[PDB]
Amino acid sequence: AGITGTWYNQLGSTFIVTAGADGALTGTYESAVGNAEGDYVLTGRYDSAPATDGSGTALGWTVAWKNNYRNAHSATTWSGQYVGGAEARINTQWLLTSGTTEANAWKSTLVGHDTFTKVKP
Amino acid sequence: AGITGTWYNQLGSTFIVTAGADGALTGTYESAVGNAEGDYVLTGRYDSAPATDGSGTALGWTVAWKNNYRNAHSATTWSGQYVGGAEARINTQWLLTSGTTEANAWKSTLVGHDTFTKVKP
Amino acid sequence: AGITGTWYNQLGSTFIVTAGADGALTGTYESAVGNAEGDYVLTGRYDSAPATDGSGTALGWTVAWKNNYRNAHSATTWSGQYVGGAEARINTQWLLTSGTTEANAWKSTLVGHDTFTKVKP
Amino acid sequence: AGITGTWYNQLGSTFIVTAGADGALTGTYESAVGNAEGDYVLTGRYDSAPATDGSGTALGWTVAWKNNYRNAHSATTWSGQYVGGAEARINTQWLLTSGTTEANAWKSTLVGHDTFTKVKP
Ligand SMILES: O=C(O)CCCC[C@@H]1SC[C@@H]2NC(=O)N[C@@H]21
Ligand SMILES: O=C(O)CCCC[C@@H]1SC[C@@H]2NC(=O)N[C@@H]21
Ligand SMILES: O=C(O)CCCC[C@@H]1SC[C@@H]2NC(=O)N[C@@H]21
Ligand SMILES: O=C(O)CCCC[C@@H]1SC[C@@H]2NC(=O)N[C@@H]21
Secondary structure (H helix, E strand, O other), rough: OOOEEEEEEOOOOOEEEEEOOEEEEEEEOOOOOOOOOEEEEEEEEOOOOOOOOOOEEEEEEEEEEOOOOEEEEEEEEEEEEEEOOOOOEEEEEEEEEOOOOOHHHHHHHEEEEEEEEEOOO | OOOOOOEEEOOOOOOEEOOOOOOEEEEEEEEEOOOOOOOOEEEEEOOOOOOOOOOOEEEEEEEEEEOOOOOOEEEEEEEEEEEOOOOEEEEEEEEEEOOHHHHHHHOEEEEEEEEEEEOOO | OOOOOOEEEOOOOOOEEEEEOEEEEEEEEEEEOOOOOOOEEEEEEEOOOOOOOOOEEEEEEEEEEOOOOOOOEEEEEEEEEEOOOOOOEEEEEEEOOOOOOOOHHHHOEEHHHHEEEEOOO | OOOOEEEEEEOOOOEEEEOOOOEEEEEEEEOOOOOOOOOOOEEEEEEEOOOOOOOOOOEEEEEEEOOOOOOOOEEEEEEEEEOOOOOOEEEEEEEEOOOHHHHHHHHHHEEEEEEEEOOOO
């Protein structure tokens, strides 16, 4: 129940997600940067029975950057963990792969990290 | 239509996916390695209108490593592109995040790469 | 001249480096976490003629985790950029590879990110 | 003694390195792709007393992409392990950071993987 809701990262992007009882993540993502405009569909999975020892809750999700406004021919996955409590966070690393020619595949994938909080930066 | 079906990676893992008309990926993943046994639910997204210039089709998906057999308290995301043709491939990089304590969060995430083909290694 | 000196990251680790006129980085690294004790040799490279348009200065370095105290059978590389000015930073992502058996090579490499500043956290 | 010498990756790039007795890597790197021409200085570190149980030898190195021909305002680090024997390899993952403006720092770093062998692809 800690994951469902709206999350904001350090770039100004916004992430609205519903966490289903058995592990589904669904929602929408709006990026403040890049070749992106409006909301994009997201889907992912999370550990619906995490450890109870103070460990975070593992999760991940994907956005393909095609919507009613634009198609960037790219997709990002975020992998990370939810940490609950008063200053809850989802700490992630991400991989953004663009469709490329075979000759350019070596430079197809960017890597970065986003930290999400329940309140805006 | 090139993405739907069964895929095999260099580790001996197996990936069965359906690519929906508007960008959804759904299916199951069976890992040959790690703290894993049986099939796990996967969900993701792909670019349903890729470029037609020889560029690959961007995609990503997530597995949370909880199923009827085991719970590893972890999740992997694969980010990559589908390359069609006679020797079709899905070339990926992945991030595997384990739920950790805050003190151990610096070592929460493994990175690697998997190449998937339509035939077994 | 902005890079030479002592840097501190969010984990409490300390990085003393000399940037040579033609691109060399040399120094020592002390990690506050992990299988590490004391100072370890570091070496790397940086762009000694960066752009002057407000872009950062690309750089990277490596530590192998063997010194007079311990040998962790591992090595980390940090890749990033130096950003000068009043609140100077070195923003990095890193890869930590452990020596593994072939069967375990898929889980040989951790990924993360460190931000270094001139003052302690 | 297994690391010293010339190595070739899947892209057609060439890596000549000397491994010093106490952990230093020095040499030159020539990339077959990207904003690169000629040889570039490399420096890094390796575990000079690896485990003897069949585990690989952890290592890493950096190239800043500035030489007598070009300056790409970028640097790559490779992190990986050397695996000896008849078909020796250095298996790596790499991070390529470009100097960027602060607004573009989110897209500063590419990630990939290179496999090096003693003979050309
Ligand atoms: O430019 C593109 O190809 C599509 C937009 C990508 C935006 C990226 S996803 C990772 C990072 N986190 C964000 O919130 N935005 C950027
Ligand atoms: O050990 C775990 O935490 C769960 C199993 C992880 C298996 C990983 S996912 C990335 C890589 N590719 C595979 O097919 N298996 C491993
Ligand atoms: O545990 C090991 O194998 C050796 C110590 C690794 C410490 C890592 S390097 C990346 C991160 N940044 C730090 O300052 N410490 C950790
Ligand atoms: O384009 C640049 O910024 C400089 C050249 C980068 C070449 C990269 S380094 C990682 C990969 N492995 C290679 O051998 N070449 C590419």
